Amino acid sequence: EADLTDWNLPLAFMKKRHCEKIEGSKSLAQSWRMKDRMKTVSVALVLCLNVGVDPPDVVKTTPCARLECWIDPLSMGPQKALETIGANLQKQYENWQPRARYKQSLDPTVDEVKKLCTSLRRNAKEERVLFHYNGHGVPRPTVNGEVWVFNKNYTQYIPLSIYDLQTWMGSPSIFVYDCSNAGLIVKSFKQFALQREQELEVSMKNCIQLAACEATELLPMIPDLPADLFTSCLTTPIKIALRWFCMQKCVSLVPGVTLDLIEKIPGRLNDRRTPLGELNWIFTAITDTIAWNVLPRDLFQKLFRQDLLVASLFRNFLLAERIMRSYNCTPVSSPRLPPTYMHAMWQAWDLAVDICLSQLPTIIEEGTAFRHSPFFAEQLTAFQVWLTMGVENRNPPEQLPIVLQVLLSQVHRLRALDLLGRFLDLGPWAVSLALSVGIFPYVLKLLQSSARELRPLLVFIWAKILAVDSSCQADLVKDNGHKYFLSVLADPYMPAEHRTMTAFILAVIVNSYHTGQEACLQGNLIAICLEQLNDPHPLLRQWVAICLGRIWQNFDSARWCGVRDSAHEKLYSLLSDPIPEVRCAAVFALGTFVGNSAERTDHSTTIDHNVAMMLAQLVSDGSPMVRKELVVALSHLVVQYESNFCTVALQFISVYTQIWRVLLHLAADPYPEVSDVAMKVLNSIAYKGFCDWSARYFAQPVMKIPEEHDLESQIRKEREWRFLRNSRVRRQAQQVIQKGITRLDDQIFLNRNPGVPSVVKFHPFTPCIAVADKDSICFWDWEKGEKLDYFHNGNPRYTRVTAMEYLNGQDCSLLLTATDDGAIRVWKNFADLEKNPEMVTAWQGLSAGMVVDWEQETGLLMSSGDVRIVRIWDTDREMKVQDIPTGADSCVTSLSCDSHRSLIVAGLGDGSIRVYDRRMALSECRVMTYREHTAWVVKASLQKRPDGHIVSVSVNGDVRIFDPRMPESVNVLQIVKGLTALDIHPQADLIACGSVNQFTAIYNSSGELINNIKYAISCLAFHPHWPHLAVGSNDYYISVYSVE
Amino acid sequence: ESQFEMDI
Structure with missing residues (x-):
């Protein structure tokens, strides 16, 4: 119950928590680019x-x-x-x-x-x-x-x-x-x-x-x-190291092994598969790990990375220190290092040596094959254990220098690459550590190996590195790495996740380096992107469009290739995509294409005009992201069009005049950010981004399960408790109705309001009163009388609020306000104006003013008014749905949605009662009319009875109930006189009755008259589910009446 | 180039 109450409905504006989160990034720690x-x-x-x-x-x-x-x-x-x-x-x-x-x-x-x-x-x-x-x-x-x-x-x-x-x-x-x-x-x-x-x-x-x-x-x-001894330790790290082992150990744990065998150990120092090879590899790994985990980075980079000989000598120096300490000598160096003989890692060395040497006798005596140690496997295991729960507020792993060594061989490479990927999936700080040790110059070499099974790992790693550090000095385009990724994109059998990451990588290197501009054409990247524009995945559509937009910047060769292949012909089809992010990417790529192609003009002026008009259609989109991109794209086209606007602007102060009208409309549209930009464009003509929002996605964790699935998180327990609270309040309202409705002579609220309370609405569960006048909306505590902060709507002067509604029960409980000029604004915290009004959107409809009724069970916004038709918008897609034609010759005073019968319910200003069936072909959705009235019809709605009978009131006061399937009425009641609309609350069986006098002539749903109740009326309203009335008056006050 | 050899 607690969940389903609101989570059977669309939450239309959840995306508004992300759409505006446009940001860059912090600077990077300097630096892995060891130029010295x-x-x-x-x-x-x-x-x-x-x-x-x-x-x-x-x-x-x-x-x-x-x-x-x-x-x-x-x-x-x-x-x-x-x-x-x-x-x-x-x-x-x-x-x-x-x-x-x-x-x-x-x-x-x-x-x-x-x-x-x-x-x-x-x-x-x-x-x-x-x-x-x-x-x-x-x-x-x-x-x-x-x-x-x-x-x-x-x-x-x-x-x-x-x-x-x-x-x-x-x-x-x-x-x-x-x-x-x-x-x-x-x-x-x-x-x-x-x-x-x-x-x-x-x-x-x-x-x-x-x-x-x-x-x-x-x-x-x-x-x-x-x-x-000192020279031997610095120049021959082994030899004496093993001799010392034999002599220093108090009690040997390997009987039979002595110097006679140590001096007979086979193999070359660099033959990785022999005893000495493996020992040299382990020795190097240990001494590098100790240096990494003891010295400050300022010394580490200078001594162990800048010069091969310096690093080798200091690496061996640590051994010389360890050995010479036992003979009362202390090696001295400049620069001075902290002592290291105490470090735990030396114990691991002794263990590895012990294991090796236990096999030496038999190998010499019998010739048994040499077995490799488990040293690196165990180090990788320990790293994997650490990865179980890594956070920024912890010591970094001590084994990154080991992973670096493992990546150099061909035995555990796949595991090391997997673990590295998992490590890098943490926030940007994880990447910086990886950069500081020198992964980068090694993965550049792995990029050109002959292996194919490494594709998804190298792609993931490079996607994360470029997502965090895009400054890499063209290394991927100076070498052949870019060719690898082009082939990766080309592979038709690779999963979409990797195709998306590859497209991202290509977009980054093309826009980042300005040398990959030719290489992306040599490989026919344009053809690949055009083929991939039809991919069903939203992100491949966005990134492919971004790649094409980034290619068509300042290229002469792929100015011509662009025009030659009519690439724009396919991109505009993405302007139909239900998801506004794809439409934005398409607008970006298309506007850039034309803005740059126009540099030639020539025959491509045919294209220039057509695209300008295709973009004009997008003024009906409604999305602020698409709309803003439209303004920017048009400005980019304006740069070229100014050469002719110099003789057209005088008319404003025939595609040019159409562009003028489009920019003027976009400026007029109620999105001040957009209005400002559009005005800057219009002014500039008269006188003379999305890609980053998308790009930041890849820098986030993707292997993390979101908190929404954390069944123990505070956010779930709290929301569920609040949901139950609201449901119980609704139950209280139901109980007070079930106990019996009596004369409404009790009192709840009386306060003086700003302006005239012409629109009065209440939240379904929360005791908060929302009342609008012409210009502003005031708010009150429905039970205490405490005054809450007000919020001016921000609409143009001389506009008027026409309708108010709430969109959801519990989580997306936004307040929507409609005005005469078509503005439709939505805010999230009428509930908490004291801290943050949090505006949600500012749409504009109707291409009587405006009357709206949003369908919460479908996510659709229905509107009518001074257009003579009914318009439907999909508030879950930010896209126009349909224009519903009618034979009426007058405007309406209604409207009401019937989500259970797909019925649009109206009274008309022409005196008829007309309804529409959403399922009919859009030539005329004629079902009725009723013809028992000639005077204007005021607010009408359907009854709670399953039959669907309609209550309709004439401006002459006649109250009549009509049959949902016949042009004839069911009955005539004449509950009120004169021109008083009947606001009815089926749950409470209450009928409101406003008049010019300071009282409301309250009736029961039976039509029985209750003596006039006192606490010109401005507005009638009911609190949802409660049998409680609210009336606004032209004396600048509102009041609430209650069952006694 | 690289400080360490890689078995590419």
Whole structure:
């Protein structure tokens, strides 16, 4: 009951909550477009490995473990070992940047270093240089960086200067120091840079430094580790990582696995399907995840994205920190990072390593196939779990860097793409995070893969990215991505949802980049859109029309292609579409087509005039969206027509005069926004948007189930309670009628009103009185007498309110007002004018004034008056329905709708009583007339009896009941005299009787007279369902009478 | 181009 009371009826204006929601968007966080792509060009390897010579401060020897680059120099001798080690160092660096320029010095002195640095600077003056200093054979550094370089005589220590080194390499640069007291060098470096800056007031911000350990500590002398531990960690992330694992673990959990097998693990570092390949992939994923989840974005983008070598070195640095911590060394870097050895992700690494190694023995011994770990599957699972309920007010997922890695392979790509799509379906903030990690440059590569099954995923992802970030610098039209989407659109078997998203994408890239303008013609996009104009789906119709409108902007080639194929011939058929959004899209595309085609004029002036007149027909549409678009489209045509209006406007102040009349009509039409624009067009001539509303749709969630289906939401419990309340009030009204109607000598309301209360109406359930005078509507509390705010209708001066009605019982309870000039306005909150009148619409009918009767069971507005016909509009489509012809030669005072018999009920000013049957052919809907009257007929209506007998009153006062199927009457009552219409309320069996005197001669439905009741009459009315009268008087007051 | 290789 509570639902059906109002939800068996159309709610005509629910769309009005969205039609005007025209908006743009906020700015985007800057920026994923990492334009700064500075790179490393050359590497200088400076070795001081003076094999066979121990500086005097060396403590020796048993645990010295003098293993360098996995070489033991004692087995080769002082010269072979040095060259061999240098070769291995070169190989270790080539694994990370094979294109680097190689430069090497073995025991250089002074001029050798100056010349090296100068030559490298000359090779690339703007790019980065890496300077790697070993120092193992050199005494502990001093504040100046003194080094044991000499002509094979140790007594020539040669003091050096960090300041001078900075001078030689003034370019952006990266320094690596393997010195014992390495931090001392960094401190001196910074102090000298400051000194130089101060001297320049009469390089600090460009250098990156990695030091093995702090200035106050020495590198460990451990018999089982390589001497060059820091270098090994930075250049060979595996190897030592596994050796450490074997040594560090207190109690091994994998019996039988030791170094003898670790050094026999097969495979290439880059062979993704081997043990080492998988381990390198996992290592990279973990170290990137830690960096993402620890550092601020300002550092993350600079260190892990701008340069391949910098990112690799810092990625390995985190490992060096973790390992060297256990030996009382603290690696030092500049810029300084927060500590990371505490992060939980390192436990995952150890687990993965443990799992791998348990298979190593048998694979070596028996040759069993290698099985892959579940690492990425579990990480994807955890992400999927997070997605269960994501909100903005939460920490972002910690695993986005893992998804990025998964997308690079061909095993879990489909799952990662699905989960990414689901993530991106959240509001715009979700997209920004995805952009900040670098999905974009990878999905651009996936866009051109040979796979076909990926189509709906790449389409969805790109639809969301473009919906949020349309600024992408033409990447989809510089490369072949646009061709992909054209093919996607072409596929006749793809679901409409994806065709719609593809059409959206194409519209965006065409209007956004101004380079896709030729490509969309090379692929015959126009032909595809024209074929697709007949698609039944509303959104494909809208977006295809938008694509065509956007194509026909400033193209010369598809000015000609447009005219050549008579594209407009098909677009105007969309002007018949029941849905106003499609009509708006069609008006946009058609107006743009002609406005731009007219630049040639030539023979196309034939088209120019015809379209102008086809648009003229749309003045009858009634929709404010279509109407506004009509005004804009006409203005676009006016731009071209002004060349001839310069000699036509003088007449206004023969298609030109028709256009003048159309624009004048549109200006006159009661939509001030439209009127204003139309007047600006008319004035401009005399003196001399929708696409964004539609576009914002795709930025919303679409996988979300709307609140309307949430059976526990407060909005449902509250609305249902209020619905029951209203129903119970109706029941109270029924009970007071059923208990018996007595003389109406009780009182409810008396208040002084503004103006003359000529129209008095009440809400079906809510005790609120709505009374109109000529110009304005006042409102009152039906029971308390409290005065409510009034609302001036806003109609032109000298107009008059003719009729008022309510449209729905509970939810869409709008107040509709009709006037003599045809204006029909609807407002949502007569109920709450104190805070927001909330105007709904402002239609105009009748192309007696205006009399209306809207059919709530059908959603139809019926109107008559000074047109001599009956007009029907579909208020659920914003479209004219029909003009109903009549043989009458006079106007009417009626009208009344009979929704159960499809009958139009009138009395006529010519004295006859005429009714119409909506089912008859529209030549004349002749059913009756009745011919027992000659004087004008006043308000008439049908009785509650199933037969459909009609009550009709003459201006002479005669009251007569007529037979619904014969021209003869049923009876004559003569209840009242003289010219008094009978307002009857069948539910209450009450008959009102107004007069020139200050009283109402109330009768019962039986015709019996009750002595005149007092609390010139202006208006008679009844509160629906209640046996209570209301009368307005020409003394500026209204009153309400009640059963005693 | 890309920092990481893709098995396109």
